[PDB]
């Protein structure tokens, strides 16, 4: 029994194989269209049918986003198909950008951006595996600053009259976690007492750092390339009956992360040497703060006076002055 | 209170006793004529032992009066078979049961 468990964990889980691009291309291929004479509109490909099934499931009214294994699997397959990966030359860089654009077309031509928005809207601000997979797929399809996908998403939102997407975004951003010094102290006291570690990562501190990074990467790629109209929509949703200011929510989360980092540094202030677990926690929190700062920078870049004024009147200055103290003593 | 009417005669010499299993094909129908049980339908000969009160009393008495290889019709009054409670979902209360039984073998 022990060998079976160890064999699983060490070999079967670690086994890796790359089939996603082949599978997605085979599904996207329109098969024998002249042999199936429809005498009408072009026939939906299997990938388009899968996307329509998922979109209809998302649009079906339910009180909660029920976990779907098919979605968590096929969204991940699509997300890896989008990326499919010593200074490269200009030809190599342009050739890779064109191939990335083609791979993203193979999905958002079939209506994947609308699905990604619909799933987030139906999530109702509850962090979960479906939300993580949807955010990963959105990052995959929007990577590099896809203007066509940005236009499709903005047009879909404005047409759909939806406040639920922004409400769910605010709920998820509020639900995003930070450093928990109490949990860190409890975990350290466990090892000091000598108890066997339960999880090697010990991810109780900073519970979800990949999810938060994906969410803010999505919120950044949504405005990548200075999409001024979409930045204005994020700040104030004009058409929508009720508006939510993601710009202020982002700086609120940045302030929370700053406070957590300041407290953690204060706990390490007296100690001469930083423990390995503390170094890991600092690295994770620094990555999270880096992504939040980049998202704010993408909100601001391009003379977006509205966002510049909102952040000026917000509490960004407190976060900056706190990070300045942290940097001055940390270094 | 079971009446036996010989549809077909048997050997006439061997009768069921103590502790001896009876192998019979039986067809039971209600007095109106509706059929509810048939071991011939199931294609499995029914096996039972005299005196262990595993079968209904009318069937037991009829088989006891029967002879080897004989085919006879058994009429069972409600009291001797299923009483007034009846069999839930099969036999209505206060129902007279008629059986067509053949004593195939004794083991």
């Amino acid at each position: 029994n022990l060998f079976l468990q160890g064999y699983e964990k060490s070999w079967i889980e670690t086994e890796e194989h790359y089939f996603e691009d082949k599978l997605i291309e085979d599904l996207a291929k329109p098969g024998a269209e002249p042999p199936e004479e429809d005498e009408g509109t072009k026939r939906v490909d299997p990938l388009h049918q899968l996307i329509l099934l998922f979109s209809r499931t998302a649009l079906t009214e339910k009180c909660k986003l029920e976990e779907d294994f098919l979605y968590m699997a096929y969204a991940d397959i699509m997300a890896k198909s989008c990326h499919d990966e010593e200074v490269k030359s200009f030809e190599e860089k342009e050739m890779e950008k064109q191939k990335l654009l083609y791979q993203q077309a193979r999905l958002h031509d079939r209506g994947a951006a609308e699905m990604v928005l619909q799933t987030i809207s139906a999530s109702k601000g509850e962090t979960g595996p479906m939300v993580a997979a949807t955010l990963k797929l959105g990052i995959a399809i929007l990577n590099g600053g896809n203007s066509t996908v940005q236009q499709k998403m903005l047009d879909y939102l404005k047409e759909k009259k939806d406040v639920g997407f922004f409400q769910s975004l605010a709920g998820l951003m509020q639900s995003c976690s930070v450093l928990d010094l109490n949990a860190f102290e409890r975990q350290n006291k466990a090892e000091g007492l000598g108890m066997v570690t339960e999880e090697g990562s010990g991810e109780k501190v900073l519970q979800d750092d990949e999810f938060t990074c994906d969410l803010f990467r999505f919120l950044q790629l949504l405005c990548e390339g200075h999409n001024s109209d979409f930045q204005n929509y994020l700040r104030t949703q004009t058409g929508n009956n009720t508006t939510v200011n993601i710009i202020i929510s982002t700086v609120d989360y940045l302030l929370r992360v700053q406070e957590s980092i300041s407290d953690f540094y204060w706990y390490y202030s007296g100690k001469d040497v930083i423990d390995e677990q503390g170094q890991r926690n600092f690295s994770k929190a620094i990555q999270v703060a880096k992504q939040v700062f980049n998202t704010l920078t993408e909100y601001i870049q391009g003379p977006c006076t509205g966002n510049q004024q909102s952040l000026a009147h917000s509490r960004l200055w407190d976060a900056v002055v706190g990070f300045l103290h942290v940097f001055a003593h940390m270094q | 209170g079971v009446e036996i009417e010989t549809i077909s005669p048997g050997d006439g010499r061997t009768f069921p006793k103590k502790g001896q299993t009876c192998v019979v094909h039986y067809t039971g129908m209600l007095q109106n004529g509706k059929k509810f049980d048939s071991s011939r339908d199931r294609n499995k000969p029914f096996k039972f032992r005299i005196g262990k009160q595993e079968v209904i009393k009318g069937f037991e008495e009829g088989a006891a009066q029967m002879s080897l290889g004989q085919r006879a019709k058994l009429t069972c009054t409600p009291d001797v078979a299923y009483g007034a409670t009846g069999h839930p979902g099969v036999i209505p209360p206060n129902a007279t049961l008629i059986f067509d039984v053949e004593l195939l073998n004794l083991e």
């Binding site: - | 077909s8 005669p9 094909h25 509706k34 011939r40 085919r71 009846g86 839930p88 979902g89 209505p92």
Partner: protein, 385 residues
């Protein structure tokens, strides 16, 4: 009107009630099926919100009160007498529309079918009435399908009433569907409801259609057509024999069919009368045929046991002799030369008679008609030809 106010003084908005009921049913009509998925979803959401608002304003109880106030009158003529003609004329339509509206307001809403659970018992009390059976059945079906709570309230006194509904109003499939819904809801089986339905419906064998596997039965007859009439040259006494060469008591699940005797035709048509051309019917299953099986005398599909020496069902090496006397109507048999203690007498002699044997499968019998076509191992009774 109940407190006996003057009919002219009574203000009864009959037409407005009917037209507003039509409008309300149109308003609560479920979405149609063509529609694109998203539009259908919007329509379903609108219907949900409409039902929720109506119930939160308590629109179910008002409809129930109207239904009760209409049900206090027994019939459309009694209401036509208490109220005016035209209230009498539209009484049935208004009651049906009210029941349909209640079904529309409850359908598909888990909460509405849950707060209708308390009033469910009062609804089923009027199930027997002919002017509300269909609407009550529809409402009960919706409540039982949607709410797993009303099933707890449903008891034996209601299950037996629903079964008596099937017994009284006839074979209706909607009652069966309601009974099916009473068993399993949302993948959960109610053992008590299953047991009650089984033990209260199945044993009777009087409402549901009954089924059985029946052996096919065919009949053999000679050319001879025997008839008697005044001033006609036909001998009134006849005799023939049948002998079983081989027969199998059980070629299948059911017993082998083997009956012998005479049959009669209606009128002078040579076609045998009174019996179906095909099926499990043989000699003696109608008042035109007269049969013998070795143990009983068969006529009119009713059998009476007849005594004989060494009684046995007809089997291998058995010889049956049949006697017909048209002078004094009497049909008599003798098995293996021994007379059976019974006869068929005083039957109709208007038509023609002929020998006949009915069988199902696994038989081997031979007609002994005498002379060249056979011979008689037992001598014919005197007089009989």
């Amino acid at each position: 009107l109940s407190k006996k106010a003057k009919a002219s003084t009574v203000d009864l908005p009959i037409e407005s009630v009917s037209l507003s009921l039509q409008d309300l049913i149109g308003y609560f009509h479920p979405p149609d099926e063509h529609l694109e998925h998203e539009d259908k979803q919007n329509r379903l959401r609108a219907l949900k919100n409409r039902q929720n608002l109506f119930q939160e304003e308590g629109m179910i109880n008002l409809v129930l009160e109207c239904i009760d106030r209409l049900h206090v009158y027994s019939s459309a003529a009694h209401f036509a007498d208490v109220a005016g003609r035209e209230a009498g004329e539209s009484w049935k339509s208004i009651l049906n529309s009210l029941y349909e509206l209640l079904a529309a307001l409850i359908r598909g809403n888990r909460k509405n079918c849950a707060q209708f659970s308390g009033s469910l018992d009062w609804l089923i009390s009027r199930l027997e009435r002919l002017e509300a059976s269909s609407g009550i059945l529809e409402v009960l079906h919706c409540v039982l399908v949607e709410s797993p709570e009303a099933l707890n309230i449903i008891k034996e006194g209601h299950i037996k009433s629903i079964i008596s509904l099937l017994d009284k109003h006839g074979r209706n499939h909607k009652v069966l569907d309601v009974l099916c819904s009473l068993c399993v809801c949302h993948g959960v089986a109610v053992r008590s409801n299953q047991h009650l339905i089984c033990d209260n419906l199945l044993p009777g064998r009087d409402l549901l259609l009954q089924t059985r596997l029946v052996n096919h039965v065919s009949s053999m007859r000679p050319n001879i057509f025997l008839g008697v009439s005044e001033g006609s040259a036909q001998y009134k006494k006849w005799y023939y024999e049948l002998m079983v060469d081989h027969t199998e008591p059980f070629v299948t699940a059911e017993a082998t069919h083997l009956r012998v005797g005479w049959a009669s035709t209606e009128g002078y048509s040579p076609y045998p009368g009174g019996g179906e051309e095909w099926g499990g019917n043989g000699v003696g299953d109608d008042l035109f045929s007269y049969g013998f099986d070795g143990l009983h005398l068969w006529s009119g599909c009713i059998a009476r046991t007849v005594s004989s020496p060494n009684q046995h069902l007809l089997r291998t090496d058995d010889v049956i002799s049949c006697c017909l006397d048209l002078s004094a109507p009497s049909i008599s048999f003798r098995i293996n030369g021994q007379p059976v203690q019974g006869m068929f007498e005083n039957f109709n002699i208007d038509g023609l008679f002929f020998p006949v044997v009915s069988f199902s499968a696994g038989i081997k019998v031979r007609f002994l008609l005498g002379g060249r076509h056979g011979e008689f191992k037992f001598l014919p009774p005197p007089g009989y030809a």
